[PDB]
Structure 1
Amino acid sequence: KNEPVLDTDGDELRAGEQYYVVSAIWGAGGGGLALGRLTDQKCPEIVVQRRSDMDYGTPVVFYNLDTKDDIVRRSNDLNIQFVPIRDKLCLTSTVWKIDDYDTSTGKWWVTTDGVIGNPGPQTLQSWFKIEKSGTLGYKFNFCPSVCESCVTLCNDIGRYGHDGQTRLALGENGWPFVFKKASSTIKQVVN
């Protein structure tokens, strides 16, 4: 099938397991991804990047389009869901989703309140791909294939500042990330 995505230990990513998503570029490239809030629309929570490269953020879990495939592979539509350790600030879902166009900034933001499964027109905004980013990590790509007769955006995901926070949005140059096992996943390779 398609080539598996690898984590920072060299292990193939497993669907249903927790991974931190951490910038492959540290320093001013920042740390990991997490749920954030906008003052003007506190729910759903938005996707933000921690500024500290020592802060891995909140892990995500990946859900394959083909639920029978245990491995997360490049160029395959999947759903992405934050699994917060903390209490719920919002009752919307923590599944990533592309927002409606933001006229005040010109951006298509990554936000949450996405849906898991049910591939097709209704869930089009909830399907992401992971692609290789040259020789350094992986980039997220919004280019869903789940609806043949749907017109869709087809763009890499970059990072962009907004209102003092680092957000993710569609762009020309995708930002590179690596995947680090969370503690729950480390248990899956040890007896």
Structure 2
Amino acid sequence: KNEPVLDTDGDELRAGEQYYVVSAIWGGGGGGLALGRLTNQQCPEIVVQRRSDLDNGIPVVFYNLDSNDDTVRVSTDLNVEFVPIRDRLCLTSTVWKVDNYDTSTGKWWVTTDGVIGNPGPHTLQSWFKIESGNLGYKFNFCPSVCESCITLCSDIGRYGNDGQMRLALAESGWPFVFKKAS
């Protein structure tokens, strides 16, 4: 039983509850996370952070490994899905997922069209951990759903690309806090 993940009201995060994922840095930290697109790619949508502090972005929900635990805890494999307020053009899912390696930038981006549940080698790319910190919570991609799978193991940092703040694997991660969509 790992320590539960807490939101800005000090309440524990619950699976299936909507939360905005906002930058923990108060003062020049940017807003929350949302969806964007690329010049050469409308679908699936990529994960971006808002530049503006005013925009908390799009809420997410968290899915736990077992559907019978309803507490979000540190160091535990999670599915992350954007819950858009309105329907979207793309038919891809809005579930976070580590992309294939981008040879044009050398980065492993966070994109969508992941999958919910069914842990193991088929859904490996859709599993994320939340790790605690001094500044706040930081996302970590290091899935344990497949003990014999070779996997990347790294924090999720933030990195500009063609005018948008994207998420990608990095040595040091970007800190976030969680705000109820209430």
TM range (shorter): over 0.9
**Is the counterpart of residue 4 in structure 1 residue 19 in structure 2?**
no
What's 2:138 paired with? 139
Q: CA RMSD in A?
A: 0.7
1:42 is paired with a residue of what secondary structure?
strand
2:125 is paired with a residue of what secondary structure?
helix
1:27 CA drift (Å): 3.4
One-letter code aligned to 2:173? G
1:2 CA drift (Å): 0.5
1:26 CA drift (Å): 3.3
How many Å separate the matches in 2 of 1:73 and 1:54? 28
**Is the counterpart of residue 94 in structure 1 residue 94 in structure 2?**
yes
2:41 is paired with a residue of what secondary structure?
coil
More helix by share: 1
1:87 CA drift (Å): 2.2
Identity of paired residues, percent? 86
Residue ranges of structure 2 left out of the alignment (5+ in a row): none
1:88 is paired with a residue of what secondary structure?
coil
How many Å separate the matches in 1 of 2:107 and 2:89? 25
1:53 CA drift (Å): 1.0
How many Å separate the matches in 1 of 2:120 and 2:31? 33
1:86 CA drift (Å): 2.0
1:7-22 → structure 2 map (5 Å cutoff)? 7-22=7-22
TM-score, length of structure 2 as denominator length: 0.98
1:29 is paired with a residue of what secondary structure?
coil
One-letter code aligned to 1:29? G
What's 2:66 paired with? 66
Residue ranges of structure 1 left out of the alignment (5+ in a row): 184-191
What's 2:115 paired with? 115
Number of residue-to-residue matches in the alignment: 182
TM-score, length of structure 1 as denominator length: 0.94
| Structure 1 outlier segments of 4+, above 3 Å | none
